[PDB]
Ligand binder design. Structure first.
Ligand SMILES: O=C1CCCC2=C1C1(CCCCC1)N=C(Nc1nc3ccccc3o1)N2
Ligand SMILES: OC[C@H]1O[C@@H](O)[C@H](O)[C@@H](O)[C@H]1O
Length: 393
């Protein structure tokens, strides 16, 4: 099997969500919102180091459809097959007396976290159906898209008077506290600020962002899901953060963004062998991401793709967050004529690779990758998509 997976269009997700809502609450929902998943083109394990990242939002998205309530109740239904039980859930709005807490089902910890830290009041209660085409925990940020869709819904109930970064950070806080995943800010930011036909260069120190056109009929972004997820993934992520902090402290730096590749080379003995390799990835990856944005600006897909491949080797050998399945998928992809570059994307230890290629080479690329992969790969061909949006029903 080597054809791209169906990507449900928005009209399909809306129809499903409204049918599930009518059938469950006996009336037509009044509001719809959505927020997408994402793929990171380059700039991996840099966001929590205040570095640069270059993601784009995907046509895979999460949809909320719902209505405000007057009884201070939050009533949730999700139609997503792989969400853990129960898929119906209710709880009253938190107060200074009773705050929400992480519990079961896990998929609602994302919604609760966001309601809990939502910065404006008064928030009414609401009824809402959650649908999503983002493969749950597939490495394309299903949780961030649920958080951001929830945030975008709350804004319709109680407008915040805030900024995009504040919203991303609310959603990042929910991830940290209600899901126990100490992520950076990239996934929430792109889900919030994506735009069709654009990648988003995010400066995670200044919080400056740039919408870089990424729309060329002859260019494709191929996402390949390894469909494996090593247990190591969850546990090594904080180990990598902590190794990064060690090097930053040793160089007297607020973060590794403040550390130049040449300052690192000059301070080997102040840090371990492993910590040095981890910082060398991060420092070089920040520089590669800036160079990739420039390459994209001039339409230099060959240079962009070479930087991707250097990003992969750095992640495999210096940061050690790849795995044999990702490495095989990358090497397979790079043997296909028309492919500019390929690399793991997201956190690592499983999940997806991202491949930049000539659009006409996509059918060959998918066949060749599948035939040279010991597992069962899944594929997405995605254009750069919109971030969070609202449709009044
Ligand atoms: O178990 C893990 C491990 C860490 C990554 C991750 C999860 C699970 C969360 C619990 C249910 C299945 C998997 N879900 C997400 N994201 C997500 N779940 C959603 C449910 C409905 C709508 C949109 C959703 O996005 N991420
Ligand atoms: O670049 C690695 C990325 O891994 C993601 O899973 C994480 O949520 C992001 O914040 C980023 O750190």
């Amino acid at each position: 099997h080597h054809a791209a997976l169906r990507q449900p269009q928005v009209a399909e997700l809306l129809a499903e969500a409204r049918r599930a809502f009518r059938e469950e609450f006996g009336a037509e929902p009044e509001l719809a919102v959505s927020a997408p998943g994402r793929v990171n083109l380059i700039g991996e394990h840099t966001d929590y180091n205040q570095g640069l990242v270059l993601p784009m939002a995907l046509e895979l998205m999460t949809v909320l459809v719902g209505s405000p309530r007057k009884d201070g109740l939050v009533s949730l239904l999700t139609t997503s097959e792989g969400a853990d039980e129960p898929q119906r859930l209710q709880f009253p709005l938190p107060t200074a007396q009773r705050s929400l807490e992480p519990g079961t089902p896990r998929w609602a910890n994302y919604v609760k976290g966001v309601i809990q830290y939502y910065p404006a009041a008064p928030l009414p209660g609401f009824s809402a159906v959650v649908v999503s085409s983002v493969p749950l925990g597939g490495g394309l940020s299903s949780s961030a898209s649920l958080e951001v869709a929830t945030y975008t819904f709350l804004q319709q109930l109680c407008p915040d008077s805030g900024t995009i970064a504040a919203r991303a950070q609310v959603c990042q806080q929910a991830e940290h506290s209600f899901a126990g995943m100490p992520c950076g800010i990239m996934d929430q930011f792109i889900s919030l600020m994506g735009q069709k036909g654009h990648a988003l260069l995010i400066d995670c120190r200044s919080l400056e962002t740039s919408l870089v056109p990424l729309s060329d009929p002859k260019l494709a972004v191929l996402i390949t899901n390894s469909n494996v997820r090593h247990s190591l993934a969850s546990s090594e992520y904080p180990v990598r953060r902590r190794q990064c902090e060690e090097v930053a402290r040793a160089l007297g730096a607020a973060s590794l963004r403040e550390v130049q590749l040449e300052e690192l080379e000059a301070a080997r003995d102040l840090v371990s062998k492993e910590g040095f390799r981890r910082a060398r990835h991060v420092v070089g990856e920040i520089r590669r991401t800036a160079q990739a944005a420039a390459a994209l600006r001039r339409g230099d897909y060959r240079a962009f793709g070479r930087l991707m491949v250097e990003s992969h080797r750095s992640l495999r050998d210096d940061y050690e967050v790849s795995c044999p399945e990702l490495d095989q998928l990358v090497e397979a992809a790079l043997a296909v004529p028309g492919v500019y570059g390929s690399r793991m994307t997201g956190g690592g230890f499983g999940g997806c690779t991202v491949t930049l290629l000539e659009a006409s080479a996509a059918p060959h690329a998918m066949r060749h990758i599948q035939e040279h992969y010991g597992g069962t790969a899944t594929f997405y061909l995605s254009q750069a998509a919109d971030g969070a949006k609202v449709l009044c029903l």
